[PDB]
Amino acid sequence: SLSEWDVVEWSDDQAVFTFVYDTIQLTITFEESVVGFPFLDKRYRKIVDVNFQSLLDEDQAPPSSLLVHKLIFQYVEEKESWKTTQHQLPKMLEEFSLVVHHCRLLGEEIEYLKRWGPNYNLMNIDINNNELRLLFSSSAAFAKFEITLFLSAYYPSVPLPSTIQNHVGNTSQDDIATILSKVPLENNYLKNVVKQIYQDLFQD
Ligand SMILES: [Cl-]
């Protein structure tokens, strides 16, 4: 059948496997040439290296796509810093496909917010590495604040650290932490947090 990758390639000695998801590449190096059926086997095979490569032009890409690529980059980087036991191909690949899927979704949410954000009083979006900064502002509501959300490739399944810089009104860290907690850790998390913030703090 198929998987979430467009293409799988391997070396002539079959020790190095490349998996491609558009502009994203994951390279897996086995201790020795792979024999048998790596996805069906269930055979212990020693993996000595896992590498992320990116085909992305940082100069010709929306900051959102860059964020996406940076999150997967950092995800694979931190994964490899484990150096008694290692993950095995099928598992590695399942998790990775899911991570890529969800991070691409996230990029789309960012695009939605860049376009439609003023409808929720979201007047600025800034991305710095993995930090997403959202400025909410309304003279009418008498509320202005910027929350910093620290994202990860595990998005949206994990709770987000956050920080707030308050300017006008009474909005606090606690209020924001509360809102983040109420929204279900699943698809559209970010769009749903923005909506929650709008309803609670700007409709009110
Ligand atoms: Cl196979």
Curated annotation (Swiss-Prot):
Source organism: Homo sapiens (Human)
Region ranges (Interaction with NSL1, DSN1 and required for assembly into the outer kinetochore): 1-178
Annotated disease: A chromosomal aberration involving KNL1 is associated with acute myeloblastic leukemia (AML). Translocation t(11;15)(q23;q14) with KMT2A. May give rise to a KMT2A-KNL1 fusion protein. Microcephaly 4, primary, autosomal recessive: A disease defined as a head circumference more than 3 standard deviations below the age-related mean. Brain weight is markedly reduced and the cerebral cortex is disproportionately small. Despite this marked reduction in size, the gyral pattern is relatively well preserved, with no major abnormality in cortical architecture. Affected individuals have mild to moderate intellectual disability. Primary microcephaly is further defined by the absence of other syndromic features or significant neurological deficits due to degenerative brain disorder.
Name of the gene this protein is made from: KNL1
Name listed for the protein in its UniProt record: Outer kinetochore KNL1 complex subunit KNL1
Top-rank taxon: Eukaryota
Tissue specificity of this protein: Highly expressed in testis, where it is localized in germ cells, in particular in spermatocytes and in the pre-acrosome of round spermatids. Detected in the acrosome of ejaculated spermatozoa. Detected in adult thymus, bone marrow, colon, small intestine, appendix and placenta, and in fetal liver and thymus.
Post-translational modification: Phosphorylation by AURKB negatively regulates its interaction with protein phosphatase 1 (PP1) subunit PPP1CA and with microtubules.
Top-level taxonomy: Eukaryota, Metazoa, Chordata, Craniata, Vertebrata
Function description: Acts as a component of the outer kinetochore KNL1 complex that serves as a docking point for spindle assembly checkpoint components and mediates microtubule-kinetochore interactions. Kinetochores, consisting of a centromere-associated inner segment and a microtubule-contacting outer segment, play a crucial role in chromosome segregation by mediating the physical connection between centromeric DNA and spindle microtubules.
Subunit structure: Component of the KNL1 complex composed of KNL1 and ZWINT. Part of the ten-subunit outer kinetochore KMN network that includes the KNL1, MIS12 and NDC80 complexes; a bioriented kinetochore contains approximately 150 copies of the network. Interacts (via C-terminus) with the MIS12 complex subunits NSL1 (via C-terminus), PMF1 and DSN1; the interaction is direct. Interacts (via N-terminal region) with BUB1B (via BUB1 N-terminal domain); the interaction is direct and is required for cell cycle arrest upon activation of the mitotic spindle assembly checkpoint.
Localization terms from the record: Nucleus; Chromosome, Centromere, Kinetochore; Cytoplasm
